[PDB]
Amino acid sequence: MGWAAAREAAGRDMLAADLRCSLFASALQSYKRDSVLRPFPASYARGDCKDFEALLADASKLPNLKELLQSSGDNHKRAWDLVSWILSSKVLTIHSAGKAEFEKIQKLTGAPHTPVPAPDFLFEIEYFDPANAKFYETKGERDLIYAFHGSRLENFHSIIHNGLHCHLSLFGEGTYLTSDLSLALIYSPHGHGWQHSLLGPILSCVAVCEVIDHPDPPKYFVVTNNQLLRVKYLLVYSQK
Ligand SMILES: Nc1ncnc2c1ncn2[C@@H]1O[C@H](C(=O)N2CCN(CC(=O)Nc3cccc4c3CNC4=O)CC2)[C@@H](O)[C@H]1O
């Protein structure tokens, strides 16, 4: 996606654009970047060779999104290229939501049984076709379940773009979900986001999943076929 298209997208929802940059920074900065930074910007790869040192360096030169947008940049050329890539997707996009939807989420997942904190920011994932149509076609007459999934921040760039995978032979294969946000949170410790983020530099992210209902101390449950679920919301918490 081009620079003018990037500037319109970022201007329409800066906190959603900022999140996508913060989640990219978190994956990039992680020692696990080789595996967690997927999708990877092809501009920073030769063949199979990913140049994480070029990418880490260029990432650390990105100004905050207010500065990037207010600066008429042909000098912020490398930054625009990178932010344009970050905010591009033909499959989905992300939308800032108000805590008028945290009420909705709570109603969908079920009233909490244990004290829980309120997210500082909430975000919804909009899926475009064929992906969107495919999900509802798979769903059919079956009703949708809403459950939480906690994870380390460096995993959310890959979780969002590639979806939740199923494994990591051993113990327990499939994705673990819970209707108690207090259980999901123990799997979502604070991680390092982006120093120029409007959300703040240290964040915790919890996913809300749309689960197609099929026979599948707080209670939890496991989803083995990954065609039956998708991240629909993101609960973001900033450390103060
Ligand atoms: N596309 C992806 N990119 C990077 N990580 C991805 C990914 N898709 C899934 N994952 C990540 O894989 C990790 C994974 O398989 N794991 C890690 C931990 N483990 C058990 C476990 O998940 N238990 C478990 C138990 C109860 C509740 C919750 C969890 C997790 N979240 C919860 O809310 C099972 C194997 C996982 O943490 C997940 O968030």
Tell how far CA 237 is from the center of its chain: 13
Could you tell me the CA-to-CA distances from 95 to 12, 20, 165, 184 in Å, in that order? 9, 11, 23, 22
How far, in Å, is the centroid of ligand 1 from the Cα of 187?
8
Q: Is 136 labeled as ligand-binding?
A: no
Q: Scan for tokens 């990039």, then name that residue.
A: 28
Solved how?
A: X-ray
Rounded CA separation 80/65 (Å): 10
DSSP class of 187: G
Q: Is 44 labeled as ligand-binding?
A: no
Give the resolution in Å. 2.9
> Which residues touch 65 (CB under 8 Å, ≥6 apart)?
10, 14, 17, 18, 21, 83, 196, 198
Ligand 1 first shell, C-beta below 6 A: 36, 148-151, 155, 158-159, 162, 164-165, 168, 172, 176, 178, 183-184, 187, 220
How far, in Å, is the centroid of ligand 1 from the Cα of 216?
17
Rounded CA separation 52/35 (Å): 12
> Which residues touch 19 (CB under 8 Å, ≥6 apart)?
94, 121, 123, 199, 234, 236
How far, in Å, is the centroid of ligand 1 from the Cα of 181?
15
C-alpha torsion sign, points 133, 102, 162, 76? positive
Cis peptide before 115 (omega within 30 of 0): no
Rounded CA separation 84/88 (Å): 6
The count of domains in the chain is 1
Q: Scan for tokens 């459950």, then name that residue.
A: 147
Q: Scan for tokens 């995993």, then name that residue.
A: 155
Rounded CA separation 235/230 (Å): 15
Q: Scan for tokens 């913060």, then name that residue.
A: 22
Q: Which of 146, 176, 230 to mutate to test the pocket of ligand 1 (most atoms within 8 A of CB)?
A: 176
* Ligand 1 atom closest to 206 (CA): 33
| Cβ neighbours around 69 below 10 Å, total | 18
Ligand 1: which residue has its CA nearest to atom 2?
159
Range of the domain at 199: 1-240
Rounded CA separation 117/181 (Å): 9
Rounded CA separation 157/161 (Å): 6
How far, in Å, is the centroid of ligand 1 from the Cα of 221?
12
Ligand 1: which residue has its CA nearest to atom 9?
164
Rounded CA separation 116/223 (Å): 24
Rounded CA separation 43/60 (Å): 16
* Ligand 1 atom closest to 220 (CA): 26
Give backbone dihedrals phi and psi of 146, rounded to 5 degrees, phi first: -125, 120
The tokens describing 197, both together, are 């983020």
Alpha-carbon Rg for the chain, nearest whole angstrom, is 18
Residues pairing with 123 in the sheet: 96, 234
CB 91 within 8 A of CB 127: yes
| Cβ neighbours around 115 below 10 Å, total | 6
DSSP class of 114: S
Rounded CA separation 236/240 (Å): 13
Half-sphere exposure of 29 (CA within 13 A, CB side): 18
Give the end-to-end CA distance of the chain in Å, rounded to a whole number: 35
Burial of 169 (0-12, 13-18, 19+ CB in 10 A): exposed
Ligand 1: which residue has its CA nearest to atom 1?
159
Q: Is 176 labeled as ligand-binding?
A: yes
CB 101 within 8 A of CB 117: no
Residue 17 DSSP SS3: helix
Residue 225 DSSP SS3: coil
Ligand 1: which residue has its CA nearest to atom 16?
168
Ligand 1: which residue has its CA nearest to atom 29?
176
CB 183 within 8 A of CB 113: no
